[PDB]
Write a protein that binds this ligand. Structure first.
Ligand SMILES: CC(=O)N[C@@H]1[C@@H](O)[C@H](O)[C@@H](CO)O[C@@H]1O
Ligand SMILES: [K+]
Lengths: 30, 242
C-alpha cells in the first residue's frame, strides 16, 4: 500500500546518491 | 558485495540479514515484503549436497541494519521464524531453478524509518522494467551495508556466459567487459534483493533475488537472479494460505 516508498527518501522528497543512475538507464540503457 | 559503495542510512529499509542462530553466522540476505513475511533464496535454507536443511528454530533475521557487526539498539529488530516455505519445484540438482523461499516471522515487525517493505512486481512492472540495459540495484555486505547498481543483461549473452542451463525463472545482471564499470553481489549476498525504481510511480520493486554466480565480479560472467515476478503466483498462494 505504502510499499516501496522509503521514509527517509521518497517520503521526504529526497533522492539517494545513485538512484539517478537507475532512472537514467531507462533513457540511455535501451 | 564487491566493487560497490556504502549505502546511505535507510536507503534499503527492506534489507534483511538471515543468520544461523548458533553458532552465529550471516548466511544470506533477504527482504521484507510485509510485516510478517521475508523473501529469500531457497538454497540459503536447503541444499542437500552440503547437508543444509534449516528449520524455523535454527535461524534469526535482523531487520533495519546498517552496521555489519554492531548491535544497532533501538533501530534494528531481530525476529524468530514461525515457518519456512521452499518452492516445491526448487531445482537444486541442476541449476537452482526456482531459487525462492518465504519465511513467516513469529511476530509482526513494526515499520520505522529503517524498516519498511519493498513492493513485489505485477505483470505491468515486470514487463516495463525487466529489460536488458536497464539497471537495478543489489545490496549486501562486504563495515556498513553495501550497494551496487547493475544492468540487466540480454538473455542470449547470459546464456552464452555459462555452461549452466538458464531457465525462464532466472535473469542475469552485471556489467560487460566493455562497459568500464564493475560490481557484483557475491555468494554471501545470496537471497538478497535486486530492486528497481519505477519511473512511473516512484516506488521500489523487488525484481530479483540474488541466486548464483560463478565467481564474484568476474569479467564476462554475470550474477544470476531468481525472476521474482515469474514466481509471484506461488508467493501469493503461500501468503494467502499461510
Ligand atoms: C533434505 C530433505 O530430505 N528434506 C527435508 C524434509 O525431509 C523435511 O520434511 C523438512 C522439514 O521441514 O526438511 C527438509 O525439507
Ligand atoms: K561481470
Amino acid at each position: 500500500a505504502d510499499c516501496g516508498l522509503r521514509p527517509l527518501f521518497e517520503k521526504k522528497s529526497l533522492e539517494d546518491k545513485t538512484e539517478r543512475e537507475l532512472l537514467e538507464s531507462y533513457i540511455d540503457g535501451r | 558485495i564487491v566493487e560497490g559503495s556504502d549505502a546511505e542510512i535507510g536507503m534499503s529499509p527492506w534489507q534483511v540479514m538471515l543468520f544461523r542462530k548458533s553458532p552465529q553466522e550471516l548466511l544470506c540476505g533477504a527482504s521484507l515484503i510485509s510485516d510478517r513475511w521475508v523473501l529469500t533464496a531457497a538454497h540459503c535454507l536447503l541444499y542437500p549436497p552440503w547437508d543444509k536443511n534449516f528449520t524455523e528454530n535454527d535461524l534469526l533475521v535482523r531487520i533495519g541494519k546498517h552496521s555489519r557487526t554492531r548491535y544497532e539498539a533501538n533501530i534494528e529488530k531481530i525476529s524468530m521464524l514461525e515457518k519456512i516455505y521452499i518452492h516445491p519445484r526448487y531445482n537444486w540438482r541442476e541449476n537452482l531453478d526456482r531459487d525462492i523461499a518465504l519465511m513467516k516471522l513469529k511476530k509482526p515487525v513494526a515499520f520505522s524509518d529503517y524498516i519498511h517493505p519493498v513492493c513485489l512486481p505485477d505483470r505491468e512492472t515486470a514487463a516495463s522494467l525487466l529489460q536488458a540495459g536497464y539497471k537495478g540495484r543489489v545490496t549486501g555486505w562486504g563495515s556498513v551495508l553495501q550497494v551496487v547498481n547493475l544492468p540487466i543483461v540480454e538473455r542470449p549473452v547470459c546464456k552464452d556466459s555459462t555452461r549452466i542451463r538458464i531457465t525462464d525463472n532466472m535473469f542475469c545482471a552485471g556489467y560487460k567487459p566493455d562497459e568500464g564499470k564493475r560490481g557484483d553481489a557475491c555468494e554471501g549476498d545470496s537471497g538478497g534483493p535486486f530492486v528497481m525504481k519505477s519511473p512511473f510511480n516512484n516506488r521500489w520493486y523487488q525484481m530479483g533475488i540474488v541466486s548464483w554466480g560463478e565467481g564474484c565480479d568476474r569479467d564476462g560472467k554475470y550474477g544470476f537472479y531468481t525472476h521474482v515476478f515469474r514466481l509471484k503466483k506461488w508467493i501469493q498462494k503461500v501468503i494467502d494460505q499461510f
